[PDB]
Structure formats: C-alpha cells, structure tokens
Copies of this chain bind each other. A is one copy, B any other.
Amino acid sequence: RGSHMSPIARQALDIAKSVLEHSKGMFDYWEGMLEQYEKTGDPDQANKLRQTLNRVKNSVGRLESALKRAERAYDTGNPDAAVGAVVELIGNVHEIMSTFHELF
C-alpha cells in the first residue's frame, strides 16, 4: 500500500518552474543581441541565432505544457499518469539548459 513517496516528482516540478522563470532573463539577453546582429552584424550569423532561439521557444512551450499536465494529474489524484510528463519535464529542462550553455 505504498509506491513513490519520494521528492523526485516535486523536485522536478520545482526545477522546471525555476528554469521557466530563469529563461525569461536569458531570452531578453539574446533577443537584444539578435537585434544588433540583424541591424549591423553578419546576416548568416544572426540566422543561426534566430533559429536557435526558435528551437528554445518550442522547448519552453513543451516544458510548460508538460508542467500543466503533471500539475493536473496530481490535482486529480493520479500520480501514475504524470510519470510520463515528469520524464518529458526533465527532457525539456535539459534541452533549455543545454542550449543556453552553448550560447554562453
């Protein structure tokens, strides 16, 4: 009559919200740098940064969607249904952290 009483699920939900809040500041930094490149710098250089930022925007969207599906499955009372979302939760957290790490 027991299963997962571990903090792994809540830790994953917390690090996903922390990355979502922290990604806003890094998006503002690189969108401001993209504005300078799209006005003065090389166009092919700015294209790589633009496409890279677009791919992060998709990863951010997949992160916040899995965050809602995991929060909903915990409010309804089905911890087994959110296990797949938590696996996807860390997946998009990794993609976001790994991309901004390459930019810096």
Contacts and interface: CB of A to CB of B under 8 A. Distances in A.
A51 interface: no
A94 B104 CA distance: 22
- What bracket does the count of chain A residues touching chain B fall in? 20 to 34
Contacts of A84: 101
Copies of this polypeptide in the complex: 2
Interface string A2-14: 0001111001101
Nearest to A86: B97
Contacts of A101: 83-84, 87
Interface of A: 5-8, 11-12, 14-15, 18-19, 22, 83-84, 86-87, 90-91, 93-94, 97-98, 101, 104
